[PDB]
């Protein structure tokens, strides 16, 4: 029994020592590798991630069907990074970025570096150069599916080529790199976090579709326990409904009381119906930050 | 004749003495090697296995087409093991575990160890370390097909490498290890049990598909006679329909009487139609356990 | 910090040195590759393009739904080129050119070279021949979608074939080539500029539809920052409402004052309502040119 | 400059040498491939065609809405051909030919070959047989839209099948073949001339509708510059108002003087109002022929 | 020239050999396929048909507006067939046959087979059965427009189904089948003769409307040159005015002399006014038959 | 010949075997399907029907202009049915039944079931329920034209819906159902008998209009040869003049002698003028029944 607990602890310890923390863990453990993170713009996803956001210096993959919200998510990551003064780059092979929508999400477009490479190889080489510079914090690649190999222009093999080198340089510079993928597997193994995202419904303000009910699953997580999920809405032209997540997480954590349709904080009603309570948190950011901080301290 | 019976018995005896019990047997013999087992969650499969479940300290392979039920089966093995206080590990290369579904099947997610290895070699080494610890009872690997060799990332040979060492350490610690495989052959020879599983139909509650008609064949069995089969349903979001198997096995064994569509036990009707009779056993677990125990004593 | 600025500058510099200027840039940078351009006939689009027009010696793609204005746009490019004495060619697979409308837009039909090829391959070969001649400045192909491969007559592969060779010869002769496409991806990668155009409304002179509200997005731009947009009207039988764009851009740039509905320049009213102010600029081209020149100097 | 003119000429020359004259041309050039033609019965259309009529040995397509005048046009082509002793065939899938109207247009019905095929394939095979005979000058098919494939009776693919073979044999025998089409694209590419025809108004002799104002556009022309247009009237029961076209073309070419409503030739009035002047030319065919010849020499 | 005549003859010959006589012909040729025919009751129509009547063993379609005379025509075909001892069938989906009117036209109602099918499919199957019996000479279907498909009761596709089989069996048994259609196209292609019939005026005996001026056009004719026309009257309660046609055809053929309003044959007046001359032929059938025979010999 | 008679007989036999007797027949044949019938109250109509009345278990349609006698006819059918002890139902959507007039015609109003449904669907469902009961012999629906679909209240489609089911249940219970229709076609195909009725004149007893001269045509008859007609009078407040029909039919059949205006039976005068002879038959019902029976035996 006890000696078995010690045997287990030693074994887990030796494994971790050889392959690194995160090479094995209990799915219910609170522990999370100590790493610099960048918020995803979604409170429930930062929590599902265990570390409070995406890890710096690591490779991350985000995949899902068309219109699932992959780009919105990455744009919110960029805005969050830029909010902290970090330098971001956008490697584009999709040719679909909407700067108007991006600014609405907080992205500083004027200072966003951008590249629209001729081939998959060129994209990967530009990524490595930015990684080795030690002067770029976040690199988003949209998308992997559009990274046509030079020969095919004039695939799976291309990715295995410079993936090992790219990972090494990203790690050394502490550069976060996100690959967006639309629904071979060199990315599957080199990524420290893989997110599965999809639209699971519509948000209706009466009878008009105004947003999407979204769900993200952390299918791979080398910094904290994997398989947790996040659910949130993406409002058209506005992005992730962060405050709506704050309303639910506040209640769940017993920081915000819910009596039927009326929500209240510290005794005073903040709104009838999830919609009004959300509007209230949004207009009172100072109190929202406190509640958010409280939730993070409780779940992270 | 008689001297021929004695000659046969001696020959079989010498063979067994040299290569172990299970190296040869009559397909119709009742005898089953005395071994600790872990239920598969399926009554007809535990019976098809001859020992009442999967053998501890041995390697087991479970293969079948996509959506055949391989994972559900392994998750039920884990839940059954955890129900007895055993420590389980999940080595994942598929990145598809659904903890919500897992808890529904009885899995204690919080205490399930999990690893998402970088390479096939790393997975195998983690397996060996957990085996040598003498502190892990069940290890599930999902899946073999996803165990990409390091070189291929930056196959058949990889498996033959540490398979002999892994088997030795598993045996010594009495650790059960299950390899899930999706449809070279080092696994084929080192495994003590190999299960072929597939979907042979759909379960309809009227006209809506609610489950899968499933069939498992024990193509290899070194603990008891091989080639027996098991048939059972896997209900969406619920797992193996254990009680439905109990209804049929109870009847077959003349413990439960069937008169047309009405089933009865000890004189009293328990339901009209296999569905209601199943519901009854499920709501009266204490009586179900007795009938289950009876069936096991009769067929094991 | 500073050393990080220098590290960034060096990295961007090395990238540019290896893959050419335009291989990476800040979306808010003023810099634009020094290149010969040809006006598109639209002031806001020439500005959105960053270089003041489409680049000579490069491949350009213009795509959009039916009736979005693709042809009108290309015809205005041709007229602008011919206004400077440049030799233009029209490779037609649509068989829909209206010379009456074309002359209205300024096109010199009599001197416009035209080809109506039998197959996609023949079209591409004619394009290459005109490119290699060093005697053709602008080549418009209408459209890509109508370039049926010979075999299919008696696709994606056809385009990848001679696209690399065509691009080389166009570059060497400094010949601008525009592919019109109606809504595989060899064009997507070889093009230096890709324009997304569509009708976003109707222009009504009371209650009669007289034009189309149009929007063009520069989804790909290898000569200056991509993703900018242009909005302008296309009047039936007249083409792009250049003067209407001049009214708005003049105001925006504080060159033309707007007080309610009355517009004025240098103190004197030029018209009440965007329509009259536009008419005034149109009848006073000499002053319009000055204002246009001013806007270009300010935004280019 | 000059060397650029020579470079252009050589390039155009090489293109023409490789793909044939007509593979590229200036829209304003006077040159027209030297080919045998058959008048369409319309003076402005024979001119719009550049060669003075439709080309022998080539495929021609004539399409337009219902009642646009497609059949009348083809019937006038047949009459013109028969006037020169040429053998004509009519492949019919519409079953609507009016011999009374046809004779009025000059068609020699008794000697017109006719076929009413069972399937699209049979029609095409009959066409090929007539082509290979070297004894048929003009073949009219009415219509393409009615050429139902055998299978569909007991489409796009059917046309691509024998279109290449038919074209070859027609060319070799110098047989003109016209496909009438009512508003896949194998015809679009194999045709040397494609005509778009439609009714753009009504002809009123007071308040009674007596004819149709018609417009034909040469959307494809491989024998001379494409995109020219023709406008003429089609009088009920009479066909194309040839003399009315002669009045306008004579004036335009300054062969016939117009002073208000009075027209005159060589000093003498021929009628007040376009209607009377037309009647005069019609009653004085010998002078009309001279004026017609003059116009052709001036515009062809 | 001559060799061209021989080339033409050979080509036409080969075509006829491959697709049958009637697959191509000169519209003015006297030749008519040698076939058994059944008079339509109209002398000018039997002549317009070229063979003297409708062809046995073939499918015929007769269409026209309501009250155009379609039924009267078919009833006269039946009477003519029955006059020769032929067995006739009437497949009815209109439910409007007037036996009193039918007997007046010569129809032997008592021996006319009749069917009033439940569905379009049933009608077609009954037709095939009667065809395959080799014991039915004429089948009239009234009408196609009323042949509602079974599914639609509890269309174009239905007709294409058994049309090929029906045609085969009709041909083999030499059974004439007529489809009446009121104003997809499987009938259009399988029919050997298609007749377009309509009312073009009224017959007045003073000021009272007593009949209809009728015109039939043979829009499709695979047994002789198509496109000929027939004009005759249909008197209320009497049917086709055969004798009135005989008066005109006799005159036209110079067998009957007309001097103003007086008609005469072989020197003797037979009546003043087309009406009396008709009455005379009708009361002197023996002489009428001779004149009729003469006309047929001259025009057939 | 003979073998052709046998071929015909076999073919007709096979047709009848496949689609039922009545699927084909000679219009002059005496044969009538053996079926239970209900007199229509009109002797000439029962004869025109071939079976002596309307068929039980089948659907019948009776249509005609307003005031043609449709209701009177159905009321006489009901009275005749009730005279034999049959249970009748009246489904009313017209709301115009006159019980006083009905009793005069022999209808037993007190025992007549009646329904005045809210919607067309409800009417049809009530009909089906009465049909499936096996306890209702005759159902009259007045009228189809008034069967407004539910949706239209808060048509052609409605009828096709339950017409097939209704027909099946009516047949199984041997229930006669009559649809009255006032002048889509699901009724047209499901009905076994369709009657066209209209007023063709007035009955004057001097100069006062006392009745209507009526004519019914059996346009559809699946139990015996169709297209026969019936003529009889409908006297105001009395119904069908049955005896007047008996006078004419008796004479026609040479059972009653007519010498000018005097009628006589078996030698003795029964009245001068059709009116008196009718009165005589009416006052001597016992002799009238014999004559009626005689006529039926002769014509049925
Ligand atoms: N320019 C925009 N303006 C307004 N709302 C936008 C815009 N772009 C995206 N959205 C919103 O973003 C939600 C998420 O879409 P998006 O993030 O672009 O999905 P995606 O999976 O990243 N893209 P793709 O691979 O092309 O389907 C949508 O359904 C829109 O409501
Ligand atoms: N998250 C889930 N929620 C509900 N039902 C599930 C879930 N996962 C699996 N099932 C059920 O499990 C049945 C068995 O599927 P599964 O056990 O995952 O097959 P598999 O062969 O193990 N997997 P794979 O190799 O990926 O096809 C399915 O058809 C589902 O009804
Ligand atoms: N011949 C013409 N005469 C007058 N106005 C024209 C003519 N051709 C085009 N236009 C105008 O051009 C606007 C732009 O149409 P167009 O430029 O032809 O779109 P497109 O996308 O290029 N063509 P397509 O692919 O065929 O739909 C129209 O809506 C018309 O108002
Ligand atoms: N039989 C005829 N008699 C008198 N005028 C005719 C006749 N046929 C055609 N026309 C005239 O021809 C003009 C041109 O019609 P037509 O040439 O038949 O057009 P279409 O496009 O060829 N036919 P379709 O495809 O059937 O609409 C008409 O509007 C008529 O004035
Ligand atoms: N029962 C009848 N009695 C007297 N004349 C009749 C009768 N039926 C038809 N006719 C005459 O037939 C001429 C031709 O009519 P008809 O032959 O029935 O045309 P239809 O096109 O066949 N029928 P439909 O489709 O119903 O319009 C009419 O105008 C009548 O003069
Ligand atoms: N209440 C009544 N009293 C006396 N005579 C009646 C009565 N109802 C009907 N009749 C007679 O019935 C003859 C036949 O009329 P009717 O049977 O009601 O025609 P209908 O076509 O059934 N009805 P509708 O659709 O309303 O016109 C009439 O002209 C009347 O002489
Ligand atoms: Mn995206
Ligand atoms: Mn699985
Ligand atoms: Mn266009
Ligand atoms: Mn036509
Ligand atoms: Mn008819
Ligand atoms: Mn009524």
Features:
Rossmann fold, ATP binding (chains A, B, C, D, E, F), 11 helices, alpha/beta, three-stranded antiparallel sheet, ATP-binding (chains A, B, C, D, E, F), 26% strand, 300 residues, binds phosphoaminophosphonic acid-adenylate ester, Rec A Protein, domain 2, homohexamer, nucleotide-binding (chains A, B, C, D, E, F), 15 strands, binds manganese (II) ion, stress response (chains A, B, C, D, E, F)
Beta-strand percent range of chain A: 25-35%
Count of alpha/pi helices of chain A: 11
Shape of chain A: globular
Radius of gyration of chain A: 21 Å
Chain pair sharing the greatest interface: A-B, 34 and 33 residues
How many beta-strand runs of chain A?
Answer: 15
C-alpha termini separation of chain A: 31 Å
Query: Which strands sit side by side, in order, in the main sheet of chain A?
Result: 6-5-7-8-4-9-10-11-12
CATH 4th-level superfamily of the largest domain in chain A? P-loop containing nucleotide triphosphate hydrolases
Q: How do the helices and strands follow one another from N- to C-terminus of chain A?
A: HEEHEEHEHEHEHHEHEEEEHEEEHH
Explain this structure to me?
The structure is a homohexamer. With about 300 residues, chain A is α/β, with parallel strands linked by helices. Chain A has 2 domains: about 25-240, Rossmann fold (3-Layer(aba) Sandwich), CATH 3.40.50; about 240-300, 2-Layer Sandwich (Rec A Protein, domain 2), CATH 3.30.250. Chain A is built from 11 helices and 15 strands. The first copy, chain A, has helices at about 1-20, 45-50, 70-85, 100-105, 120-130, 150-155, 155-175, 185-190, 240-250, 275-285, 285-300; strands at about 25, 35-40, 55, 60-65, 90, 115, 140, 175-180, 195-205, 210-220, 230-235, 240, 255-260, 260-265, 270. In chain A, the strands form 3 sheets. Chain A has a 9-stranded mixed beta sheet with strand order 6-5-7-8-4-9-10-11-12, sandwiched between helices. A 3-stranded antiparallel beta sheet of chain A has the order 13-14-15, covered by helices on one side. In chain A, a hairpin with a 4-residue loop joins strand 9 and strand 10 (about 210-220). The first copy, chain A, is globular. The interface between D and E is medium-sized, with 33 and 34 residues. Strand 6 of chain E pairs antiparallel with strand 1 of chain F. The site of one phosphoaminophosphonic acid-adenylate ester has 15 residues of chain F, from helix 3. One manganese (II) ion binds near residues 70 and 71 of chain C. Chains A, B, C, D, E, F: It is found in: Cytoplasm. Chains A, B, C, D, E, F: Its main location: cytoplasm. Chains A, B, C, D, E, F: One of its GO terms (molecular function) is single-stranded DNA binding. Chains A, B, C, D, E, F: This is Protein RecA. Chains A, B, C, D, E, F: Keywords: ATP-binding, Cytoplasm, DNA damage, DNA recombination, DNA repair, DNA-binding, Nucleotide-binding, SOS response, Stress response.
């Amino acid at each position: 029994d006890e000696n078995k607990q010690k045997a287990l602890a030693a074994a887990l310890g030796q494994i971790e020592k050889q392959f690194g923390k995160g090479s094995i863990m209990r799915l219910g453990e609170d522990r999370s590798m100590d790493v610099e993170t960048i918020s995803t713009g979604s409170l429930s996803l930062d929590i599902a991630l265990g570390a409070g956001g995406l890890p710096m210096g690591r490779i991350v993959e985000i995949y899902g069907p068309e219109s699932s919200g992959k780009t919105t998510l990455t744009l919110q990551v960029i805005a969050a990074a830029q909010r902290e003064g970090k330098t971001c780059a956008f490697i584009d092979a999709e040719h679909a970025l909407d700067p108007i929508y991006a600014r609405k999400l907080g992205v500083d477009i004027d200072n966003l570096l951008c590249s629209q490479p001729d081939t998959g190889e060129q994209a990967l080489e530009i990524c490595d150069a930015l990684a080795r510079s030690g002067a770029v914090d976040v690199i988003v690649v949209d998308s992997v599916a559009a990274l046509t190999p030079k020969a095919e222009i004039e695939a799976a093999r291309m990715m295995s080529q410079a993936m090992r080198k790219l990972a090494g340089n990203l790690k050394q510079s502490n550069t976060l790199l996100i690959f967006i993928n639309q629904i071979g597997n060199a990315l599957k193994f080199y990524a420290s976090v893989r997110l599965d995202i999809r639209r699971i419904g519509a948000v209706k303000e009466g009878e008009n579709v105004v947003g999407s009910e979204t769900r993200v699953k952390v299918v791979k997580n080398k910094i904290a326990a994997p398989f947790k999920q996040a659910e949130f809405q993406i409002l058209y032209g506005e992005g992730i409904n962060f405050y709506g997540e704050l309303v639910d997480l506040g209640v769940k954590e017993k920081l915000i009381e819910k009596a039927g349709a009326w929500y209240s904080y510290k005794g005073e009603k903040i709104g009838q119906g999830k919609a009004n309570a959300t509007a209230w948190l949004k207009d009172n950011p100072e109190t929202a930050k406190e509640i958010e901080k409280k939730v993070r301290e409780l779940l992270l």
